[PDB]
Amino acid sequence: RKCNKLVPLFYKTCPAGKNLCYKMFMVSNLTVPVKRGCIDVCPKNSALVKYVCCNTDRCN
Amino acid sequence: RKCNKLVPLFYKTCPAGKNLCYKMFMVSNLTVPVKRGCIDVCPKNSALVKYVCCNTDRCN
Amino acid sequence: RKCNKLVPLFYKTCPAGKNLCYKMFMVSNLTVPVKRGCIDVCPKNSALVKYVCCNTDRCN
Amino acid sequence: RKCNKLVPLFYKTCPAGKNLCYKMFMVSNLTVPVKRGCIDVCPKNSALVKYVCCNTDRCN
């Protein structure tokens, strides 16, 4: 699995066990993610934090 | 086709069907390449990024 | 400390302990950086590559 | 045993009793070794340095 980084024109190969890609937002600001990378399962949505997950190369 | 990589001292052979080389820029700034490689046809849409393509070896 | 990445439109906060920014060049081509980042001490041995370091934010 | 020097395009014949070649890194910089040569036994890595050793000609 490959995934985009915070600057999404670049990407990285994921470590073993992490086959989702994700995009993380402060709920107050849905214009720009604060983080992007690899992950195992999608974290739950917090009151302050929103996750978007998908399962193909470079989908975040 | 051979094309330069982001650091243009270095280069690669293009896969089958990619016979243009490109430099990719942020829309703001057309002097600092953000990516370089091979491509089949040059993208034209207004986006966050802009491609400049060419058709000779290591022309990017 | 903050330093530029290889595409110097982008940058990062240095990990603690690394307070210099650097460009890395091939030897005798001191015009095309090959790497950019953060480092603790500027390497000085004769090698295939040459580091040029500075100690202010984004000075590389 | 012949081993590569810090500039690894050049090599040297090892003294007697040194039949491994090595390269040594500062742990903070795995890009460029700080040392190369001949050795008898691969030393343990430390908090400060990493050794890579091998046992054939010009393997470092």
C: neighbours with 3+ CB pairs under 8 Å?
A: B, D
Using alpha carbons, select from C3, C7, C57, C59 the residue that is nearest to residue C33: C7
8 A C-beta contact, residue D19 and residue D59: no
**How distant is the Cα of C40 from the closest Cα of chain D, in angstroms?**
8
Closest residue of A to B48, CA-based?
A: A9
Q: Which fold has domain B1-60?
A: CD59 (2.10.60)
CA distance C28 to C37: 20
For chain B, list the strands marked E by DSSP.
Answer: 2-4, 11-13, 20-26, 35-39, 49-54
Give the C-side interface with B, CB within 8 Å: 6-9, 26, 29, 32-34
Burial zone of A3 (CB within 10 Å; 0-12 exposed, 13-18 middle, 19+ buried): buried
Half-sphere exposure of D47 (CA within 13 A, CB side): 0
Cα C47 from chain centre: 16
**How distant is the Cα of C57 from the closest Cα of chain D, in angstroms?**
20
Using alpha carbons, select from D58, D28, D32 the residue that is nearest to residue C45: D32
Quick check: D32 and C39 CB within 8 A?
Answer: no
Domain borders along chain B are: 1-60
Resolution of this deposited model, Å: 2.5
**Residues near C29 by Cβ (< 8 Å), separated by ≥ 6?**
B9
Quick check: B6 and C7 CB within 8 A?
Answer: yes
Closest residue of C to D35, CA-based?
A: C45
Half-sphere exposure of C32 (CA within 13 A, CB side): 11
Identify the experimental approach.
X-ray
Quick check: C17 and D32 CB within 8 A?
Answer: no
Q: What is the DSSP letter of C29?
A: B
- Count of CB atoms situated within 10 Å of the CB of B6: 16
8 A C-beta contact, residue B21 and residue B60: yes
Closest residue of C to D5, CA-based?
A: C47
Closest residue of B to C35, CA-based?
A: B7
CA distance B60 to B9: 11
List of chain C residues whose C-beta atoms are within 8 Å of the C-beta of residue B34: 7, 9
What is the C-alpha end-to-end distance of chain D, expressed in Å?
A: 12
CA distance B12 to C6: 19
The two structure tokens encoding residue C47: 């090698």
8 A C-beta contact, residue C24 and residue C34: yes
CA distance B2 to B13: 5
D and A touch per CB criterion (3+ pairs under 8 A): no
Instruction: Note the residue count of chain A.
Output: 60
Cross-strand partners of A53? A22
